[PDB]
Amino acid sequence: CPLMVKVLDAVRGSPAINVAVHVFRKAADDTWEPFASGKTSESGELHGLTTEEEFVEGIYKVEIDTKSYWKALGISPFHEHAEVVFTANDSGPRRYTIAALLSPYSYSTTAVVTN
Amino acid sequence: CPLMVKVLDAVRGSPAINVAVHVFRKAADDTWEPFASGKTSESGELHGLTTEEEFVEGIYKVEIDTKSYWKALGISPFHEHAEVVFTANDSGPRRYTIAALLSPYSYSTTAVVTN
Amino acid sequence: CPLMVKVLDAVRGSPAINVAVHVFRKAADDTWEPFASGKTSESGELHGLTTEEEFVEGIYKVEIDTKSYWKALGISPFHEHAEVVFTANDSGPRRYTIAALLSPYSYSTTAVVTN
Amino acid sequence: CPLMVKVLDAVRGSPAINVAVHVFRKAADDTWEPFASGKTSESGELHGLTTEEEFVEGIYKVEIDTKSYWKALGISPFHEHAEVVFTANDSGPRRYTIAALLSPYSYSTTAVVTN
Numbered sequence A, B, C, D: 001c002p003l004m005v006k007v008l009d010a011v012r013g014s015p016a017i018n019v020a021v022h023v024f025r026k027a028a029d030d031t032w033e034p035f036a037s038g039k040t041s042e043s044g045e046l047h048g049l050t051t052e053e054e055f056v057e058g059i060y061k062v063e064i065d066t067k068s069y070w071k072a073l074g075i076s077p078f079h080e081h082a083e084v085v086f087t088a089n090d091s092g093p094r095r096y097t098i099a100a101l102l103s104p105y106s107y108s109t110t111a112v113v114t115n
């Protein structure tokens, strides 16, 4: 699968499980159309978001519902969500992993692009 | 100064200078109203975005134009921008520092909220 | 395997491959004795460092040779290495993943502890 | 002030106050000589560690006592400390800011080097 998401919890030192993730693609009219979504597994990973045929070049937005994650744990969060926006460009075979590390008042995200 | 933004460059180990920052506020009709904008200084800091009177309760979006930053350095970056979304002043006025650390394929953001 | 290391490159958006990793355990005389070592694979992962029988409770040090990594890429690094020091404590079945995200002037590390 | 340290708490979104910081310098006999130490202030900043005259070229180690910080907050953290090791002033005197962002199972560190 060409697009995978991984979410970690920096407070409990664990995968962030059951985190809702929504993927949008930028449309011609510059609005965000829903493209794919899911929830992270017990490993904190979300697989099977899309397929190679559907994942074309374009501008994508990945919204991670961090606020619901923290509220389910009884921990007070700062952000409404974590939003990752990027251009996917074919430059040879590419697989994208979007990884996020979450704290109540901070998040880090990084992209791992492999052949 | 109720809202301040600080941006660092993890590649060169320096302040990220002249980074454009745009602040939006969610309006009654659920759209993003432009609220304030500016550029980081030579210290990587952006002061004077707003005032105590203007910075009311609401949902705010801080969009840091990381892509233009890297491209001005001749680097093709992964993200379009770094976007921080949060509810402000829900329990009275606070002072918010939004700090961002930038790499071409990664960023971290953190919030410092003081009374 | 009870202890795994994963290293990512925030500049190129990729696994950090062929990164030397050394594990030390704190000895009775408070000196660091060599315990295990290896190099990250093409996925940026180092498996097979130790076994369940050998990985007892104690204070461990994980040294990641970030400086050699950056020098092999022709990129100017700040740190001599990335060093992660922690106490491993049996509290039920535990597997430890030490993950590191590298930039020339910054690194992040996090621990993922799972059952 | 050639060497400054700043520490933030990613859980509470605040400066990490009263964090002990110890600086060592690698000696001729390849041991770590104690060089300077202090505690972060109410702003999370530690100033006045050393002087321009005392901060000569060398390999330095900044050990941030994160464990005592979390334990004073009643939290059992993963790391013993956060340790930053770097060669300083190799091409003349520089000003170094060592910034650290803390979570119970994670930390990030970054260096800001200015002339």
Ligand SMILES: O=C(O)c1cc(-c2ccc(F)cc2F)ccc1O
Residues within 6 Å of the ligand: A006, A008, A099, A100, A101, A108, A109, A110, B106, C006, C008, C099, C100, C101, C108, C109, C110
């Ligand atoms: O920016 C982040 O979200 C991040 C992600 C990782 C990470 C990435 C991929 C993976 F398979 C495991 C990880 F811990 C490791 C460190 C890190 O800061």
Ligand SMILES: O=C(O)c1cc(-c2ccc(F)cc2F)ccc1O
Residues within 6 Å of the ligand: A106, A107, B006, B008, B099, B100, B101, B108, B109, B110, D006, D008, D099, D100, D101, D108, D109, D110
């Ligand atoms: O998440 C981030 O954006 C981040 C921020 C800092 C940091 C905090 C305070 C400061 F004055 C400068 C900084 F880089 C240090 C590390 C880091 O990952």
Ligand SMILES: [Ca+2]
Residues within 6 Å of the ligand: A057, A089, A090
């Ligand atoms: Ca193209």
Ligand SMILES: [Ca+2]
Residues within 6 Å of the ligand: B057, B089, B090, B091, B092
């Ligand atoms: Ca209110």
Ligand SMILES: [Ca+2]
Residues within 6 Å of the ligand: C057, C089, C090
């Ligand atoms: Ca025990």
Ligand SMILES: [Ca+2]
Residues within 6 Å of the ligand: D057, D089, D090, D091, D092
């Ligand atoms: Ca010299």
